[PDB]
Amino acid sequence: NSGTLAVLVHGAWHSSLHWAAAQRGLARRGVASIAVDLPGHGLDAPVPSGYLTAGQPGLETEKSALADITMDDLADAVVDALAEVRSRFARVLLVAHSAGGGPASLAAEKAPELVDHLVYLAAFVPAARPRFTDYINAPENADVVALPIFSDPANLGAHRLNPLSSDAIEVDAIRRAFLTDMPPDAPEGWRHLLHPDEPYASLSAPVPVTPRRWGRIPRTYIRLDGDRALAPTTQNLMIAEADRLTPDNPFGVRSLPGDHSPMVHRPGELADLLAGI
Amino acid sequence: GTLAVLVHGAWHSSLHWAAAQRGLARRGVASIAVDLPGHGLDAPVPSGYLTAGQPGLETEKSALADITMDDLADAVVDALAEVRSRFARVLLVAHSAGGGPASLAAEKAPELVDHLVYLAAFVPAARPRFTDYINAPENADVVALPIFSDPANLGAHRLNPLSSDAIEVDAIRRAFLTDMPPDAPEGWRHLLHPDEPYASLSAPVPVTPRRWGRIPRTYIRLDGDRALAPTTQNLMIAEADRLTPDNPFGVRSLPGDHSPMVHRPGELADLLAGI
């Protein structure tokens, strides 16, 4: 693991900060790691003009500043990060979580030489269906906790969530979807560490990958069996459908118990898993 | 085989190092960022912090009231102990109030640090409390932070970047992010934490010249700092060097504001990689 680097790509509404504890776990095994902040996430992220204002005026109608972000912009940010570290490490592992699988996969398609192994952590695999919504709305995913995404995401230019809502039922839906295994008396800092706007392209734009570029990279899926945001059945569906398109290079399959956020609630064993890939 | 362990400052978290971490990887320097107790995803919020009008924010006792300076330092030691056998060279980089816990951690376990970097950070060698330097005459020129009154009774030094008073919010911006472009996004406002543990700025940090004082160390002064005066940074350097005449500070510099890992992450990473 002396020359292995894990490039971590966060999921929708999250950022690089959610990987922090898992990065500590990886270092404990001598695995260096960096976390990419996709456009619209991290310290650079915007918020709607009323998101931090009492009453939250205009939140349901204001157009998002992320409306013009394309799927290629998200992938090219991953390509840029992979390109900056390629000459420094012999083995580069691309680790994507949830919606990050789109941009990570397209980056591996654009530049397969920059990626030595793909790791999908309950993430979107665009091999068989190019849009994440193609799986989110599939019958296998009907039993997940329905996220309170704002109506008409195409017009806002983003899939909008409101963890700062005064509606405790609304906030509790986000809580149960992402952080199901959270202790009953846990701190509430996570509420203002999420970003409200996820670019429309992230969940709704097609991600075209081919079996002769993306499909030849060694890859592993990590299924989260207690996932209430993306059903384990949907995760198995993505593994089976993608494998049928690359029969000579099938998915490696690992498994963890618990909710959609093992980097938060199981960072130690997630790092141990990643170091074993 | 070099690992940089990054300790954030007050009201911040590991998140703010992200751009500098990517810059360090460019140069082949691995890095992790520690989240001190009460920061990051572990951070609590007052019950009214996210409520319209923020009721009770001025009086509610903090959940961080019982965190001691030893708790903050022991978290740094625990992080340093996990990576010691995996890297030949461990750089402990502290920013601002992070210098307190990082220095006490280095004093508790000197074999876990090969070099200390103080990035406009508190150096407790000559004065054990950060307020000994914050309230020094050399620091009178900083942008006054709108910290809530009576931090001892609250159990925290409280900041309110979510305040409806634009002047209050702008004072936080002018102190930490003076060089912010004119039309920058607002995300930074909700990525700060309101409560900094009372011990962070007020508790004494005891280090000795034969433990902490023997570790190679560097200070990175920020010349356009409006949160911690550059004069205060030079004073900390000089006063600390008198107590360790055999091991004086290495002194480097960066222009710009108090947040170089936000506004100058490239040159900051070039500096750290060259240490």
Residue numbers in the entry:
A (entry chain A): 6 to 282
B (entry chain B): 8 to 282
Provide excerpts from the study.
Here we report that three evolutionarily-distinct BioH isoenzymes (BioH1 to BioH3) are programmed in biotin synthesis of Mycobacterium smegmatis. As a member of the α/β-hydrolase (i.e., esterase) family, they adopt an identical pattern of domain organization, i.e., N-terminal lid domain connected with a core domain at C-terminus.
The crystals of BioH3 were grown using the sitting-drop vapor diffusion method and diffracted up to 2.27-Å resolution. The two BioH3 monomers contact each other via two interfaces (Interface I & Interface II), giving a 2-fold axis-centering dimeric architecture. First, its core domain is of α/β-fold in nature, comprising of six parallel β-strands (β1–4 and β7–8), five α-helices (α1–3 and α10–11) and a short α9 turn. In contrast to its core domain, the lid domain of BioH3 is pretty unique. Apart from α-helices, the lid domain of BioH3 also contains two β-strands (β5–6) and several connecting linkers. Instead of D248 predicted by sequence alignment, the residue D232 participates in the formation of catalytic triad. Similar to the Shigella BioH with known complex structure, the PEG-loading cavity of BioH3 are mainly formed by the side chains of hydrophobic residues (e.g., W18, F137, and F183) from its core domain.
